[PDB]
Amino acid sequence: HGYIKEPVSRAYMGALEKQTMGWTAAAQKYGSVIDNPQSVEGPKGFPAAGPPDGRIASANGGSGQIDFGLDKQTADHWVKQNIRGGFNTFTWHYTAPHATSKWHYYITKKNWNPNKPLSRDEFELIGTVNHDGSKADTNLTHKIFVPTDRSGYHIILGVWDVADTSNAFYNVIDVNLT
Ligand SMILES: [Cu+]
């Protein structure tokens, strides 16, 4: 169980907005993930397997832990944070740092549609971090190259595959790429 803390994952943005907007107004915007941003857990094997199209942001309800709130997708719905193209660091926070096989990071394609549900064919792999099966916290921050051919509203998807289960954690990040 864990989430991407820098940049701020949408899930983690939910937990944050709970503090500023209150429980009801934040849950209206994000769903029940605001209480458990660490629980965006669904089947591993992405992109060939894993959560279905339209259910990637919520990891298909976090396998019963959260609702489908994160699967809403419009140009205006989610808080964007500025990111510059090129090398960037991605830092996960773990509430339970499980044995890990790999992490893998995707960005939306130049022509993606921000007003349609997320589909796996809108995403392109930008880097893989292989791990030895030790706990996730032996490598907290990853250096990933974010394509420089691309700007405006994009989504970075980070995926954390758990070594000893059939699950993974899916964290979408809303970015304004300069
Ligand atoms: Cu966990």
Side-chain angles (χ1 to χ4, degrees), residues 1-71 73-115 117-178:
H1 285 63
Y3 55 84
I4 302 164
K5 176 170 59 52
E6 188 200 321
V8 176
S9 71
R10 179 196 295 173
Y12 177 47
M13 199 71 85
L16 291 181
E17 281 207 293
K18 157 196 180 173
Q19 324 215 258
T20 52
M21 292 177 31
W23 295 85
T24 293
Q28 269 158 350
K29 185 174 172 176
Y30 292 88
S32 60
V33 68
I34 61 171
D35 286 349
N36 302 299
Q38 74 273 17
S39 314
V40 192
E41 191 182 14
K44 72 178 171 192
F46 187 89
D53 290 344
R55 293 285 168 243
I56 296 162
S58 75
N60 208 5
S63 311
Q65 294 166 112
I66 61 174
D67 57 25
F68 297 136
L70 296 170
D71 295 325
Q73 187 60 57
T74 75
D76 298 343
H77 198 83
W78 306 113
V79 181
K80 290 71 166 177
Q81 55 220 283
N82 284 356
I83 231 83
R84 96 285 179 297
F87 282 117
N88 274 275
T89 56
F90 297 75
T91 300
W92 289 74
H93 173 71
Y94 300 102
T95 64
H98 306 304
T100 299
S101 57
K102 64 172 181 172
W103 303 259
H104 43 132
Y105 289 85
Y106 305 75
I107 201 164
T108 38
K109 290 170 174 184
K110 188 188 180 75
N111 73 320
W112 81 293
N113 184 345
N115 289 303
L118 292 179
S119 62
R120 78 231 308 106
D121 66 1
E122 293 190 294
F123 284 101
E124 180 182 3
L125 180 73
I126 57 166
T128 299
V129 178
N130 296 119
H131 204 61
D132 56 15
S134 62
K135 304 290 198 181
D137 55 11
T138 65
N139 185 12
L140 285 157
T141 290
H142 311 132
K143 197 198 201 184
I144 298 296
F145 197 92
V146 169
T148 62
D149 61 354
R150 209 153 313 199
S151 72
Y153 179 30
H154 284 283
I155 288 164
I156 291 167
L157 174 65
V159 195
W160 168 35
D161 285 6
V162 176
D164 65 334
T165 67
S166 58
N167 297 320
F169 290 77
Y170 295 83
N171 271 206
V172 295
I173 306 157
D174 298 285
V175 296
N176 181 45
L177 247 74
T178 64

